[PDB]
Every structure is written in structure tokens, then in C-alpha cells.
Design a protein around this ligand. Sequence first.
Ligand SMILES: [Zn+2]
Lengths: 87, 151, 184, 81, 129
Amino acid sequence: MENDKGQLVELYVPRKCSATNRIIKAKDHSSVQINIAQVDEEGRAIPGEYVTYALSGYIRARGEADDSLNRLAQQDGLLKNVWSYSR
Amino acid sequence: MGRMHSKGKGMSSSAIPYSRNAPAWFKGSSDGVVEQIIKYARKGLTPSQIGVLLRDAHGVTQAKVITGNKILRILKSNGLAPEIPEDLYFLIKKAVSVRKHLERNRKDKDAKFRLILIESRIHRLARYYRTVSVLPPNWKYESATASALVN
Amino acid sequence: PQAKILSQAPTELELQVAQAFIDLENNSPELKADLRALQFKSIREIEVAGGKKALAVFVPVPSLAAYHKVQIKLTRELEKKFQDRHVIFLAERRILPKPSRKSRQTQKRPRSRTLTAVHDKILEDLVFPTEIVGKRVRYLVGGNKIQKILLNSKDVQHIDNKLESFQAVYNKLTGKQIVFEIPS
Amino acid sequence: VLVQDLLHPTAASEARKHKLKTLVQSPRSHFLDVKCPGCLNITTVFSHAQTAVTCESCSTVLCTPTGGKAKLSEGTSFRRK
Amino acid sequence: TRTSVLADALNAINNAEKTGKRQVLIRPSSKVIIKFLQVMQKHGYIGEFEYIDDHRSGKIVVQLNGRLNKCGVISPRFNVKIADVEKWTANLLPARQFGYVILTTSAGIMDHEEAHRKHVSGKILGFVY
RNA sequence: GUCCGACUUUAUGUCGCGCACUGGUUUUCAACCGGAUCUUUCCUUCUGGCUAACCUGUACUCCUUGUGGGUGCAGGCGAACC
Ligand SMILES: [Zn+2]
């Protein structure tokens, strides 16, 4: 990735699945990127400011997409106790 | 789930409790438990029946938990261990029973195969008890020796 | 009778503990009739955080049986007499190194004299009134180990605050850190 | 399912699973203190007993062997240990 | 029968990684498994594992973070002379810039680079990358 | 310290490659390997050598009143070695 002088020679350092840490292929035509809008004090969706989660196509095909999104949103303080860490 | 001499795959067993030490609710004495084991052995009972009697009629979960020694070990310390180990003796009894059933009716081939299986198991267990030197190195299994040991 | 209850060279601090044992022996109906046959193996002091201290009495081990039968009473009376010092009734066991192949044959080392077995017994006898019901071991990412001990929820009332000091003692004995957790 | 605790699963799930399959394997059996209407002796018996347990004072059975656990003698009163 | 326990451990890790999980439950939990996972922790291919005492061989709970892609044992623990380490790395590791042939030397269970640093070599345990 | 590349028949003052040779390398650093030490933590140990070495204290102090430093003989350190 790194040239000896210290400049990048890689192209498009790829994204990674936010739920399984696996990279997203360029032609991974099943993967999605969810955007959740930030909410201010009076419930007004602030425009242009949100939080993004890149869900891979593999987990979506398996069927763990919604559960992974539940956990990931609960961790960053979006949903209250929607997901329990102990099944 | 191996079933050495068949195609079975069961795992029915017993889970020994995590705590090795004595149960909190047990009030009996270890010396009394050893005396009970000695008396049961003198009655002419194998260690497994001794353990089952201590578990059912009394609060003894298991001898090693209460005393610190095993049932056969306790008997051996007092010199009551049988000259043939219990499992091998029961295999001998089963083999002689199937041989009796065979010599009383020849045409039953399934029991012949089962006798072959039992004899193979007897040979394996005898080999194990021979390398540990529980049995003398000349110990072996033929016809009319099983009857002599059983009777 | 101060000297008889310690089979070790005298030390000023341990003489006071022996005198406290005589004062315990003063009470007849339950603190006598078993406590006469008592000894010691050089009780030692372990510093606890926050200025607290942990005295660790060292049984020769043949007396542990009696010591174990007596422990709860003697502990609470000693805590009454000894302030801020938590008393722990530890065993003393001979830890043997393994025969190096270049070392010479001595005898079959019994596994009870080994480091893990001795440490397991020490941690099990670090507290009588409660029993160890689970042992977990977690190796942190940074490369250090922790031995969680899960103790019975029943009989937890005896050890209300000694847990931390327990930790310290084990640490001071081993350097192997430890975290106590009580399951629900 | 992708993220889940195995070190601390729910106790309901603990009773859900089979013995020999828990985190640490523990028996589901227990002991009982039975009293027979005959005398006042308290007898310690096993849940899954395998013998016709009787009080030493009277020749009256208190349990009965069964493919699973013990079936009592219709008149003995027990308390779980 | 269970012959090579470390094989079962690494196979379980591989299966629970390919499916996208973050944890494994390895049952038998010997010394060698502990040392192998400790090396993987040291090199980052694994997360935060755990030993669960049962008084019977214990167990291990392994936390993953998706960084690993394949474990694997070389089931016949071949005597690997110090000259043959490079051949094993070429045949097993995908690139020279990373990967680690975990091998057991007399100085303990170590990655191949550490063993080459000590200038000591022994039998081969497995490979991680 | 040593100094060399831009300044060209030369250099230093200069532009620093951020020192082309050699050190303080306890500047914290960070390792990468060892060695000895304390664990209830032994690495075969003695038996005479040889006592190498100072826990020896005998005659004592060369020199600033200073344990820096010693001429030295019975105990007595043996992995420093036979
Ligand atoms: Zn009755």
C-alpha cells in the first residue's frame, strides 16, 4: 500500500462492513449504506448531518442485516434497549 | 457417542457437579461413610452397587466428594477388592450366559455373533487389566474358565 | 501459653495475636474444648489500598480441619479486637519445582505440591464462608491475564467488603491479578 | 446471533438447554428429605433413585424405580434439599 | 475420536469467521490452543478470548473482530529445520509482507518471525494470516 | 565531534542531505535478543584442590580528617575454575 518514500500507491482504500469488519467489494451488488438522520432537541431532523452504516451484502443475504443494524444503532445511542447483548 | 461394538450414537451420561468438596447440607461423617462402604462390601456387593446404595438410601453424593478416596480404592485400602475387576467379571458372566444359550440351541446365529462381540470386548478389557498388572500376565479367557471364575 | 500456640521464632506483632487468642480462650463454652490444639507458621502482614491492612495467619495445615471448624467466630472476635486489619486464615504448602532433565531424580512430585494446585487451594481457602462456584480466566488484548472467581450469592453477607483486600492478598502472594464477581 | 453473549446467557436459556451442554455442566437432579407417616425419621433420597428406598425403622418403601425419576409412595411428605 | 484438538479449535474458528460471527466456543481448551490464541492476540488476528474452568479440560470463549481470514493446523507436526522455515512460509502464507507460521520451538510456541529472530526452530503447529 | 553535497581555478559566513566517519547512547524512549537475582522458585552436589574472590580481622593504614585505596595472614564464597 505504502511507497518507501511514504506516499500512497493504493487506489480507493475500500470501505468495510460496519457489522462484520469485512471489506466491501467494488462489484458487491448486494451491499447497502444506511443513513440515519441526527435529531435535535425538538425532533427536527437536522439536514445534511447524519450517521452512516455500511452493511455488507453477505449479512443481508444471510438474514442478519436487521439484527446487526439494531445492535449497531443501539451502540451509538439511537434505539433504547432494542437489542440485548445476551440472547 | 462412539458405541465401540455397534452403530449407536448416544451420549446419555451423568454430569459430575463442579464443586469437588462436600455438599453444604451433608451432615454425615466421612469415617461413618467408610464404615458403611466396608459393611456393604462385606455383604458381598460390588463397588457400583455400593455407590448406588449410598446415593439412594443416604445423602452420599459420591464417595470421593465425601471421603476423598474412590469406592474401589477404599475397598483396596481395606483389602476387599475382588481378584477380578467388576466390569470384567460382569462381561464374563454375560459371555457364559450367551454360551449356555448357544449350547442349548444351535441354530440361533444372532446370539453367536453377539457372543463373538462379547468375547472381543472381554479380550480388550483383559488386555487393559493385564498391562496395568491388575491381573497376572498369564490370565486369559477360554471355555470352562469363565464358569470357574463365575461359580 | 503465648509461646505454645506458635511453632516459630517469636516476633513482636505475632505475640499480640497470640495474646488475643488467649483472650478468645478465656470464653469457655464455645471458644474452648477445641482451640487448645492450635499453632502458627509466621503470620504475615499484607498492605491493602487506602491504608487498610490484611493479616494472614498461616496454619501448619494438619490443624486446618479444626481451624476451619472454628474460623467464623474467631474471625469476627479478632476483627472486634483488631481494627482495620482484616484477618485471613491461609494455609502454607510446599511448592516444588519440576525436575529439570539436567537436574537429578529425587521422587515423584505429588501434584498437590505443585504451583497451580497450591494456588487453587490458597484461593479456595482465601475465604471459607463462601464457596467458589465458578472460575473464569480472561486474557486481555494487551497481554495480561485476569482470573475471575464467581462466588455463591448465598452466604455473600460474610464478605461484605473484604473482597478487595482478598484481591490484594492474592496479588501480594502471586502477582496474578484477580477480580471478584457474584452471579445473580 | 452474529453478536451474542455465551459467557452470560440467560438463565432461562440455561434451563432450556440439555445437561452436559451448559457453559459448565451441572446436574438437573437434586435430593429430597422425605417423611413417612410411620415414624418421625427424615430420610434423604435421590430425585432419580434406582432402588425401593425404605426407612430403616419400618419396611415401607418411600420411592419406586422409574425410567426417569422416583415416584413416591402416595403418603410420604417431602421437602427439596 | 478427537485426535488433534487444535485442529478442532482452528476449524471452529474458521467456520465461525466465514459465517460472519464474532465469537467461538472451543470445547477442549488445551495448553496449545491457549498459546496459539495468545500469539494471534499478540499479532491482532483475534480479539478477547476467555478460559472457562469446568474442572474437566475447561473450555474457551473466543471474541473475534473480523480481522482474521483463515487459521489452520499442519496436522503432522513436521520437524522443521531452520532452513525449511522459508519453504513453509512460501507454501502456506499468501505474501511475504504478512502471515505467520506458528511453530513450537524449545523456546515455546512462537510465530515464525520470532523463531527466526531467536535463531531457533522446531516443529510446526499451524498458520495464521 | 567529524564534516560532505549548492559557489563556479578554493574555502569559511551561507543553502542542509536533516551528519556521507565516530560517541553521550539511563534523553523519557520503544523494542530484539540474552545474564543474574527474590519468591514455600535450584542450576547434580560434594570431596580435596586454590582458595580465584573479601562475609574473614589479624600487624596495620599508603594518602585530604573521607570504606576512592591498599601490603595481608587461621576461619571462611567454590561455578572464576580443577
Ligand atoms: Zn416408620
